[PDB]
Design a protein around this ligand. Structure first.
Ligand SMILES: [Fe+3]
Ligand SMILES: [Fe+3]
Ligand SMILES: [Fe+3]
Ligand SMILES: [Fe+3]
Ligand SMILES: [K+]
Ligand SMILES: [K+]
Lengths: 521, 521
């Protein structure tokens, strides 16, 4: 009996409360802030004049701004907006409760026992927060008891969906500001929790035709919708490597153990695409260790994560207990996505992984000076050979990498990002703030990685033989999550050219990676 | 050939920079605060008038205050104080650097990019801190990069010792405020890192006479000192349990797997002691899982921990990344003590342990409203039977245990502390503050556990059949670390009597435990 698997050219996009899914949309407290302060404003702006959004989207320099890219579908958006009104109002109860805690309850205390705060808590937060004083012993603060927030009614799995659609080209349009509706007859929007075993059945494949119908039924699909689901399937078709796959994503194998860092893959089975890409079909059966450096949209892509989930053994992430709006727990987020073996690792702790050893390295900067602990570089020692994936690590704190080198010893290879001009922090995180900063102050708070002198100092402290600049946002499929417009005048490109020369002139190898590349190890 | 092991009546007391060893003395940044703000003041006060300390120590109600109990040994103390002056001055460089960061550098910023802070850091802190803004986006704060602090010169293992001495009775004198010197010819003070494998050789024992001499030599001992060491040794002499051992310490075995929570043991081999105590000699060969609820002096006793270390498989502790002076990393502290398999667990995460499952439960309160995340209750499910060790958990946040019960399901047995009148927070933590609170405000900040209504609500939310009140500080050997003076008028005792009745009157079993007790499971 014939067996079928998901086509390689069909993307399954994640959806949370109508929007393309990413980390900060899963915890209810942070969803509530984004809905209230960002998403409702984008929709209401659109429904008051669709032509402004049309005019912005018509221009590539505006891509990544607060614009609905599906501007021709006013009625669908309007109906979607009115049907979900009770979900917005439930969530606004959590929004208001946090506001009340922050503005009306906590600032009334000045160093005395905080027991009376708990007796005054809004119902949405009762039993689900902890309060305490900061370092001055007088200014009250709080954090969330995160798993009780996920157990609350404000975390609602029925608001989660996926949208199936074909992929017809390498480039992807910016997706984070457009409601995720079934805009065309080729697309299918299905109600399903992002952690569902049903999604695993989909991605694992190997199903008979009748099994596919059982699966379609468990998804509540019938009729032409079930036939469309079926049409997304087609008859089903070990020594060392290090492979640069794209942006910050690198694949390795060592003595049979596999590793994938900051995962982002592209698709295949459509004509006209670039050649020699590392796509989903190139993945091995098992990904023993998945490593994530930090919680930025371009390093943890839900769409990629859900598709590879069924192959993954263990996930490694940086450790945080902040349990705040700017820094929700990454491990908790990954477990809500259905990853069941997640390990958090602190500064300079070591963990053995197959035949290799992984060490977490400090990662400072690139987070707009927010109190965010969820970031690290990963050093992997593959026997005698050690590789650092530094992602967007900076050298804003001079001497740290010298101090780190004194503990970790020598490193042979360094992948380092050089996105030296980054977005304003308020663009990514502003909806989470209690109130805005004044505008000129806000402008100084950016999400910058290493420029040339910063990278130079890191490489000099660590003394690798090979240095690759990566994580530059050049691959067209990264357009889902960032603006991908490139020229060799860009300060970032110039600064990477300097770094590459610097390293060449010291006797090492160096290169800014552009597209897939097989490598030493 | 005859073999020898450490006598049961010989205690090996930990010493850090001259003082009895406990958690907050190991990280250099917190040692520096305690030395500068507490210990130097106690010594200088003593050396100006020994008779005040004599007069305080003469009275039991004062025990636990800032008093040197070895008051008759003025010259030894004076010489010790003058010989260690260069260690105090090295440490004062770290003290001053932190002060400068907190008072002069950080308050100059008001929301703008913090990069220039790093360029101004004192040398002691360069490369070893991270700065960032709090929730208001304008008030700057910081934390330590903890392993770089341990790699710095301010963390100095040569300042660590142990002191061997006989134990001749159950009661122990309060030890935390008296320099740990060789006050008598029966005592031996040895320079050795607290994490040394040499200490493991000592505690494991089974050594021949000549092996003991090799060991004495590796400790740098010769002559009469080596003979005194030798005299501390004597010829060397599996179904389910739950055993209350003392204060908050409970031992369990389940399907062969062993568990020890909040370890504190007493000694034996001396006449006149209470009968039927669970002492070091009663330990099994292996302690598979060691669990610590929180980082208070009466729940993590270095003296007990070092002695059992060689038997321990894995340590479980609450998770924190605060990396602050009030909340240094517990896991980092345990690894510096030589424990090599330590796992940190967050709110409501589960871990399988032998045949049982452990779940961490939220623990709020009893920490003076400080930002301290290093605290949890432990739920162990031993097959069908589940036991909660709640330690000093409170119910200051109404509804939390109801919300927790909705996630964890039913619990059969609860051990709960009821130390409802606790010390002032500034007594334990005050040396770590940047400056004092005004005195009347400070008085409201206490380290209280559950009183009667608080315990009642917890038991009511969780519905156990057995409830034991524990962790009451009644055992005489807890005098090392707290004042042990008891009467049935004490509000704490009365409130526990009410709780015990309440539970009896609902059909369950209940008891305040006093001394060792074998139990159900
Ligand atoms: Fe980033
Ligand atoms: Fe990035
Ligand atoms: Fe306590
Ligand atoms: Fe206690
Ligand atoms: K829920
Ligand atoms: K050191």
């Amino acid at each position: 009996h014939m067996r079928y698997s998901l086509r390689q050219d069909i993307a399954v996009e994640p959806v949370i409360a109508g929007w393309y899914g990413w980390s900060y949309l899963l915890p209810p407290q942070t969803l509530a802030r984004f809905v209230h302060n960002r998403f409702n404003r984008i929709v209401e702006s659109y429904l008051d004049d669709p032509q402004v959004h049309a005019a912005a989207v018509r221009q590539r320099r505006m891509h990544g701004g607060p614009w609905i890219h599906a501007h021709e579908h006013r009625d669908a958006i309007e109906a979607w907006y009115r049907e979900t009104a009770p979900r917005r109002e439930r969530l606004d109860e959590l929004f208001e409760a946090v506001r009340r805690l922050e503005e009306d309850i906590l600032p009334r205390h000045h160093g005395e026992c905080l027991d009376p705060v708990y007796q005054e808590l809004p119902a949405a937060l009762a039993g689900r927060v902890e309060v305490f004083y900061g370092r001055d012993n007088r200014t009250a603060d709080y954090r969330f008891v995160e798993p009780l927030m996920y157990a609350s009614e404000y975390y609602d799995e029925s608001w989660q969906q996926v949208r199936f659609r074909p992929v017809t080209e390498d480039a992807r349009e910016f997706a984070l500001t457009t409601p995720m509706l079934e805009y065309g007859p080729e697309q299918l929007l299905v109600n399903v929790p992002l952690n569902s075993p049903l999604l695993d059945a989909v991605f694992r494949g190997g199903l008979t035709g009748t099994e596919l119908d059982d699966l379609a039924a468990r998804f509540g699909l019938d009729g032409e919708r079930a036939a469309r689901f079926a049409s997304y399937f087609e008859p089903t078709p070990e020594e060392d490597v290090l492979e640069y796959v794209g942006h910050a994503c690198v694949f390795a194998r060592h003595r049979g153990t596999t590793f994938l860092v900051d995962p982002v893959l592209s698709y295949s089975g459509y004509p006209g695409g670039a050649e020699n890409r590392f796509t989903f079909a190139d993945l091995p059966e098992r990904i023993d260790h998945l490593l994530i450096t930090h919680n930025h949209q371009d390093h943890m892509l839900f769409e990629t994560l859900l598709r590879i989930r069924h192959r993954v053994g263990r996930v490694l992430v940086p450790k945080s207990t902040n349990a705040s709006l700017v820094d929700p727990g990454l491990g908790g987020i990954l477990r809500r996505l259905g990853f069941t073996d997640v390990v958090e690792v602190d500064d300079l702790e070591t963990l053995s992984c197959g035949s290799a050893e992984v060490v977490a390295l400090p990662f400072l900067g690139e987070h707009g000076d927010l109190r965010i602990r969820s970031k690290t570089g990963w050093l992997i020692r593959f026997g005698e050979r050690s590789v650092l994936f530094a992602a967007d690590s900076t050298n804003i704190s001079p001497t740290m990498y010298t101090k780190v080198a004194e503990v970790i010893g020598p490193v042979d290879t360094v992948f380092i990002g050089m996105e030296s001009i980054g977005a304003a922090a308020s663009w990514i995180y502003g909806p989470l703030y209690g109130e805005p900063l004044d505008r000129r102050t806000d402008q100084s708070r950016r999400l910058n990685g290493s420029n040339f002198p910063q990278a130079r100092e890191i490489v000099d402290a660590l003394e690798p033989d090979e240095v690759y600049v990566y994580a530059m946002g050049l691959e067209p499929w990264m357009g889902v999550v960032m603006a991908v417009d490139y020229d060799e005048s860009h300060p970032a490109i110039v600064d990477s050219d300097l770094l590459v020369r610097h390293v060449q002139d010291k006797g090492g190898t160096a290169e800014r990676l552009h597209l897939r590349r097989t490598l030493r190890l």
